[PDB]
């Protein structure tokens, strides 16, 4: 099964045929891309808030308009999928979802209300793909650049009525029914420790400092509980690379930051009339970002290495979280940088998948975001910024769907790409819940 | 080759598996969708400004979130393509294109500057797919709901340095080098009369009232010239349906409106804080619409009928023009209505294509637009409006990328879907120029 080796403009963009991305007929290539054989492994790459606009903006800046993302754009089978949520009261569609509802959708196969994790509109728990993979004996990995308590990684191991219920404190207030001291299954963090994924890497060290209000580990901090339960704790790249094995007997838990991990690129925030009043911006690498802090690609590579030891197979979810966060903050450079960051992780995954031959790789987003690419001379009512691209040309980005604090998500259907066995199930129009069934079927989970 | 019969949510959106659009594995279906055999005909449906957001907004309103457009969403092979233009002076990419540059891209295979029609950045003419089809003996059709002088339909038959050069008057001022009395090929309208497509249907009657400044038909109106050249003039649905044949000896020219044809649905314009201050809107059919005015689907159906008589095959471009125009005017109902209107035309095309077996059908857009679907309680800086959907729920649309007069286009890559021989060439990431080469190859044009 081939990956798109190169879909960059083939020559001089000015001359006829120079902008082409295809060098010949693709029919044969696609035929060789189709297989219904069972998938032994599944790697799901999620670009939080990475809609088509985000991909295009990032490509334009980093690779040029005629450029090509060796990871993100390399997936041969493409399609568009819907991700609408539900109104808790009415049960009718809520056109603009959040991370909680969307993550729950692909991880459980049931739509839900914004803010919910692993539960439906009746607050009934729903088993997640990870829990199912684990039950079947497959290795499991949950990786993200955000706090491990954030919606996307949380949805795989937690079932709470509200995403805000990070640890003991918040749960007692926001999710009384889930609160341990009130007979519930516990907070997101507690349920995370319970679910026991073989590999869990990301940020969110902060919440682990809290103490359990009940249970066998009452009074101890969630960090202590983790150690008492056999988890291997890692806080930096050096130690991460030192891990030789990860399994149910010795699960890996890597906390590389108190909150969200560091952003790759720094840049000023978009401003009112920023494209006409202020100069064009050139993103600059974040000095904070460290050799001590592993990149998403490094975490992804280590995860695959450890998970691949399991002869039965594995399920791994990787998330480029800050694309969304930076989009909210109207920061082009941060947003774009995180997309480039995710691209590297996709490459690592695709490399392994190409060699393995029985791995389904999927790259998609939870929902669309605010950012739009607009004309250089645009006078918009929101936040704008001009950027110096790899093409030596200026690109203007606009965020104009909110006044308020952050920029809002949008309900537009978006790209979903895949490679490997059962990838055909992402072509055409599908729903986010279909992804659950596709992954479940590919893995032969029964 | 199968069309997606039904990709609507299969059941109760509230229950697990109820939101699914798939009922089983799609591998076999896709295999049966792949063919490299020659295409005898090609029908290209263009939704002007119909990016993924536009499709989703229209679906949500008209068919419900879990709905399914029997035309637009029915195409099995999907992908995303780039449509950036070029800066005339530098030759570097211009991330946000207009209709002229984008239409020229798919019709000639060469990138160009915004505003150009059938010419590159050196103002050199390049043969269009229509001209090539005609040269090879194939029947040709150019259909649009806009003025026939508008960029999209014009790009197929005209070569001018500026899209503004509608007729004699504008050309002498804006396109001196193209002006007939100055030795040029003439205005868009004159070149259209020129090009002599077998079938041309749309609006733009107004410009035909002008008089040629030179040539064999000097002093006569372009209307008179058309008649003197053998064109069959039609101004209404009744007369249109009366046409039994259309060919080079008796070409059809249907002018159904002075300017752009009537919009399908009426609704108020979006306003500042429209979603919170004003009530939810329910679109209403335009009384002006007319049994006397043929719909896009009717024009499409008649076109296919006449064009299908040509044993050699045919090329037909159909354009839902007002999607873009209404998007500019920040009018959700007009925009959505035109998307529904286009969907009907796609259904007619797909129906014929399914029966014929050797027809390549492509549905895409020239560029992305401004509209975004946002949360109900959103406080945005631009124009917003709440709409009562088929789901009995509220959807809010936002236009916030411009302050002046019309909302701007956006550079986001967008959906391209196809069905039939050679459709595989639209899957994955491609460029708008690739479409030219795909159509050329499919038709075996040499
Ligand atoms: Zn999100
Ligand atoms: Zn977000
Ligand atoms: Zn356009
Ligand atoms: Zn436009």
Swiss-Prot record, chains A, B:
InterPro entries: Alkaline_phosphatase, Alkaline_phosphatase_AS, Alkaline_phosphatase_core_sf
Free-text comment on the cofactor: Binds 1 Mg(2+) ion. Binds 2 Zn(2+) ions.
Record-listed Mg(2+) binding positions: 48, 150, 152, 319
Coiled-coil regions listed in the entry: none
Major enzyme class: hydrolase
PROSITE patterns linked: ALKALINE_PHOSPHATASE
GO cellular component, one term: periplasmic space
Subcellular location(s) per record: Periplasm
GO biological process: protein dephosphorylation
Pfam family, one: Alk_phosphatase
Catalysis: reaction(s): a phosphate monoester + H2O = an alcohol + phosphate
Database matches in SUPFAM superfamilies: Alkaline phosphatase-like (SSF53649)
Cofactor(s) the record lists: Mg(2+); Zn(2+)
Keyword Phosphoprotein carried by entry: yes
Family matches, as NCBIfam families: PRK10518.1
Protein name in the entry: Alkaline phosphatase
Organism: Escherichia coli (strain K12)
